[PDB]
């Protein structure tokens, strides 16, 4: 088993400029006819791998000009020397000198941008869904940056845990920012006990904590 | 433009079996290697499967971790690759493509989930309202995926759909949330197109105030 | 059903059984 290692899972660029991603194997990849059999492929979100790079330095067949390969037989680096949009996406190198060929754990490409604080939303639990017999109660975070933030669920000033989910979308490919949902799941029953529902947001684009609130009711 | 196009995929208990297809257009199949390649996120990107031409007598080579369970073939007279997939794992869970002898073409995947849980339709509840945010909350489906759109598609400026999250019931549940003016609240109808076609389940939502 | 020959070409160049 050949293991192809990618340190690192996520990369940080500014726009224009150059980034190197690496790769290394456990076994030189160097064939005995001179050639290094490696390749390496982007992903961008929702559609099939492609390739960039065959025999560890050949630019495949409409492949822009940006993309480089290089490498000795064991250690190997994919470069891009001016980011643009359309690069952003999930990195992979793979070798195909041994069965099974083995992929790396790739290297995520993602834009850097100036910090931009969220827009905060807060929405009640219909009434459609409460006569089931659940509560469920979202916060949104709109259009941010960086992806670090921190969200904390109030109920009656009663901070929540165990009880939310979070989910977050890519990177817009427009503005570059995130947004993040956060949902908390409540009974009916313990929905209907208390009245404040609070959702509190920490954020380096905020001075101080957002809070985004509702009583329940009305 | 070359094209390779799988088929196949779904929902399928454990210990099943189950076979994928994969057709090659403008593409001299019998003369080039094919492959079958998946993708999960515990795993990542995993290499299946290879086929050789005829003229190497058409020889295979497999994973360990799929080898005596699944079979990999060809029909060059139709354009076809297979992979015969028994005795289904959990593990075998994700993505399935079929690629090229050199890996510029891949097709678009099939989805492939094996679990014993049956399917069930989603729930669609609305997040009702300078800028407003409206959404539709797609509550508690199974399998994966479940698509949504807003006003036939029509409206898809500031519109994010977020990864579906799996619940501790084992459903998954989406958010699909877009932000409009405040002023447009009560005459601008918006409209949430939901379709989560494993249990066949078709729902359109009006989001207006509370 | 190859609309052109250079996609073979370059498999052919690429191809190895022999270690
Ligand atoms: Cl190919
Ligand atoms: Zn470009
Ligand atoms: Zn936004
Ligand atoms: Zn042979």
């Known amino acids: 088993d050949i293991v192809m290692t990618q340190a690192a899972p996520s990369v940080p660029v500014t726009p224009g400029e150059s980034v190197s991603i690496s790769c290394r194997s456990s076994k030189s990849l160097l064939h005995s006819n001179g050639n290094t059999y490696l390749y390496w492929f982007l992903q961008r979100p929702g559609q099939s791998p492609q390739l960039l790079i065959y025999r560890m330095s050949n630019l495949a067949s409409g492949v822009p000009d940006r993309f480089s390969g290089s490498g000795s037989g064991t250690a190997f680096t994919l470069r891009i020397s001016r980011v643009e949009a359309e690069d952003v996406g999930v990195y992979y190198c793979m070798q195909h000198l041994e069965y099974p060929f083995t992929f790396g754990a790739g290297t995520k490409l993602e834009l850097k941008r100036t910090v931009a604080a969220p827009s905060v939303f807060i929405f009640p639990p219909s009434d459609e869904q409460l006569k089931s017999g659940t509560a469920s109660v979202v916060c949104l975070l709109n259009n941010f940056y960086p992806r670090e933030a921190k969200v904390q669920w109030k109920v009656d000033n009663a901070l929540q845990s165990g009880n939310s989910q979070e989910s977050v979308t890519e990177q817009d490919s427009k503005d570059s920012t995130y947004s993040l949902s956060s949902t908390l799941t409540l009974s009916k029953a313990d929905y209907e006990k208390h009245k404040v529902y609070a959702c509190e947001v920490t954020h380096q684009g905020l001075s101080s904590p957002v809070t985004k609130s509702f009583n329940r009711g009305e | 433009e070359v094209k390779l196009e799988e088929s196949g995929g779904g929902l399928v208990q454990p210990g099943g079996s189950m076979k994928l297809s994969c057709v090659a257009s403008r593409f001299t199949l019998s003369k080039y290697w094919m492959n079958w390649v998946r993708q999960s996120p515990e795993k990542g990107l995993e290499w299946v499967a290879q086929i050789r031409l005829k003229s190497d007598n058409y020889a295979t080579h497999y994973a360990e971790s799929v080898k005596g369970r699944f079979t990999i073939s060809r029909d060059d007279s139709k354009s076809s690759v297979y992979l015969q997939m028994n005795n289904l794992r959990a593990e075998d869970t994700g993505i399935y493509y079929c690629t090229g002898e050199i890996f510029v073409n891949w097709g678009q995947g099939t989805l492939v989930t094996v679990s014993a849980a049956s399917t069930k339709g989603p729930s669609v509840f609305p997040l009702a309202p300078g800028t407003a945010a409206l959404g539709c909350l797609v509550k508690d489906y199974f399998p994966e995926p479940v698509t949504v759109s807003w006003n036939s598609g029509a409206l898809t400026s500031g519109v994010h759909t977020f990864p579906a999250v799996l619940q501790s019931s084992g459903l998954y549940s989406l958010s699909s949330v877009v932000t409009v003016p405040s002023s447009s609240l009560g005459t601008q109808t918006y409209i949430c197109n939901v379709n989560h076609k494993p249990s066949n389940t078709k729902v359109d939502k009006k989001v207006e105030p509370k | ?19």
């Open chain 3, 1 to 19: 059903k190859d609309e052109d020959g250079d996609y073979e070409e370059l498999v052919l160049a690429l191809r190895s059984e022999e270690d």
